[PDB]
């Protein structure tokens, strides 16, 4: 039987086509750690995860140490077929650092798929190859935001993720401008990234209802830990409420289900620590009648591919996967065609379908 006999890691930095600015940070590149697992039959698997320290607490340096010194001793010499057990044993030695776990989990799935000579998407049960993404619009003044949205529509996106929560007055006034400039064929997804309080959230919802807008979701309006407010907003709202930072893992999902704190969960592999835990969330959500979407960090097209593979296998059609729009096409053109707004997996790939040759070998 196949055993994992080697583990390597590599830091990969990808340039962005434009400056990416968040509440805490500004950057021109993506930081990623890649891991390579080698079987004793020569087959190599790969996984790639972002270090988004502000969200998951991961750092490249921490991930590298965790994988080399903590996970590796558990993994080396183990049978591939025992992966579920090996991963449970390995991950229980580390609190948090979900992105480090993601990299390992993905590499394992790459191995499992390659051993069957299929794609990871196929391994996971996917049939369809294509998923629609929104385009993500950064915070800004009303004028430039309206323009950014217009560029998105002209680029063929009909689903628009509008970031809010930085300036509440701006968020409210934006609604008037949206109602004037756009019809109901454009659908909006707001993500406040924890920036609103309870009263503000209610106001924003009421304000939406004063206009005629197609608004699909209100995402993470309040602090990740204020589950009471999330439940109250979910009850108050006529628009589906999405838990993002409130849900990393299956036990977080259990809490928001128990407390009725959202209508939909935004699953991100960098939060879940990869595909196994993401599957557990989807299963819990299905049982509870809670819908799921998929999302990502500003991260490698490799992570996007893994996420799209998971969503296609899980019948998740709502996706915020835009980072492909931020990087050079030739980075992903071997495994993905992005014909906006469609992310389309290429045919006949083995495993995920990307290799690290340039980073690891050249």
Ligand X SMILES: O=C(O)/C=C/C(=O)O
Which residues would be at the binding site for ligand X (CB under 6 A)? Answer: 22, 24-25, 52, 55, 193, 244, 297-298
Determine if 252 is a binding residue for Mg ion (CB under 5 A): no
CA gap 305, 248 in Å, rounded: 19
Per CB under 8 A, which region of 59-67, 124-132, 206-214, 340-348 contacts its own copies?
Answer: 59-67
Task: Scan for tokens 């010194």, then name that residue.
Answer: 69
Question: What is the torsional sign of CA 308, 298, 61, 281?
Answer: negative
297 annotated among ligand-binding-site residues: yes
10 annotated among ligand-binding-site residues: no
Query: Which region holds residue 329: left if phi is over 0, alpha if psi is between -120 and 50, else beta?
Result: alpha
The string of DSSP letters for 129-152 reads -EEE--EEE----HHHHHHHHHHH
Please, what is the Cα angle at 62 between 57 and 65, to 5 degrees? 155
Is residue 341 a contact partner of residue 151, using CB atoms and an 8 Å limit?
A: no
Q: Which does 225 bind (CB under 5 to 8 A by kind): Mg ion, ligand X, its own copies, none?
A: its own copies
Q: Which does 129 bind (CB under 5 to 8 A by kind): ligand X, Mg ion, its own copies, none?
A: none
Determine if 75 is a binding residue for its own copies (CB under 8 A): no
Which residue number, 109 or 163, has a Cβ lying nearer to ligand X? 163
Q: Which does 297 bind (CB under 5 to 8 A by kind): ligand X, Mg ion, its own copies, none?
A: ligand X
Where in 163-222 is the site for Mg ion (CB under 5 A)?
191, 219
Site for its own copies (CB under 8 A): which residue of 225, 283, 328, 342? 225
Which residue number, 175 or 265, has a Cβ lying nearer to Mg ion? 265
CA gap 104, 273 in Å, rounded: 8
Is residue 313 a contact partner of residue 125, using CB atoms and an 8 Å limit?
A: yes
List contacts with Mg ion (CB under 5 A).
Answer: 191, 219, 244
List contacts with its own copies (CB under 8 A).
Answer: 23-25, 53-62, 64-66, 70, 92-97, 225, 251, 255
């Amino acid at each position: 039987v196949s055993k994992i006999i080697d583990i390597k890691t590599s830091i990969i930095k990808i340039p962005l086509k434009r400056t990416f600015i968040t509440a805490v940070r500004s950057t021109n590149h993506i930081d990623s750690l890649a891991v390579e697992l080698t079987l004793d039959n020569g087959v190599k698997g790969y996984g790639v995860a972002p270090a988004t320290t502000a969200i998951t607490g991961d750092t490249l340096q921490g991930m590298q140490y965790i994988i080399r010194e903590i996970f590796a001793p558990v993994i080396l010499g183990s049978d591939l077929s025992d992966y579920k057990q090996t991963l449970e044993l390995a991950f229980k030695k580390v609190m948090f650092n979900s992105a480090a776990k993601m990299a390992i989990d993905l590499a394992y799935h790459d191995l499992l798929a390659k051993e069957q000579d299929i794609s990871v998407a196929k391994l996971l049960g996917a049939k369809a190859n294509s998923i629609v993404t929104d385009v993500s619009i950064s915070c800004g003044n009303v004028a430039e935001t309206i323009q950014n949205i217009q560029n998105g529509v002209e680029a063929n996106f009909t689903a628009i993720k509008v970031k809010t929560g930085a300036d509440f007055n701006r968020d409210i006034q934006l609604l008037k401008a949206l109602d004037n400039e756009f019809s109901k064929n454009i659908k909006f997804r707001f993500d406040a990234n924890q920036g609103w309080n309870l009263a503000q959230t209610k106001q924003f919802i009421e304000e939406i209802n004063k206009y005629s807008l197609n608004v699909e979701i209100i995402e993470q309006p309040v602090k990740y830990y204020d589950i009471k407010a999330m439940a109250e907003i979910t009850k108050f709202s006529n628009i589906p409420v999405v838990a993002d930072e409130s849900v990393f893992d299956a036990k977080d999902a259990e809490r928001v289900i128990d407390e009725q704190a959202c209508n939909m969960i935004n699953i991100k592999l960098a939060k879940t620590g990869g595909i196994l835990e993401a599957q557990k969330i989807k299963k819990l959500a299905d049982s509870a009648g809670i819908s799921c979407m998929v999302g990502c960090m500003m991260e490698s097209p490799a992570g996007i591919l893994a996420t799209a593979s998971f969503a296609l296998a899980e019948d998740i059609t709502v996706a915020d996967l835009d980072p492909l729009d931020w990087v050079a096409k030739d980075l992903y053109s071997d495994y993905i065609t992005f014909n906006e707004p469609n992310i389309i997996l290429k045919d006949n790939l083995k495993g995920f379908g990307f290799n690290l040759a340039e980073n690891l070998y050249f």
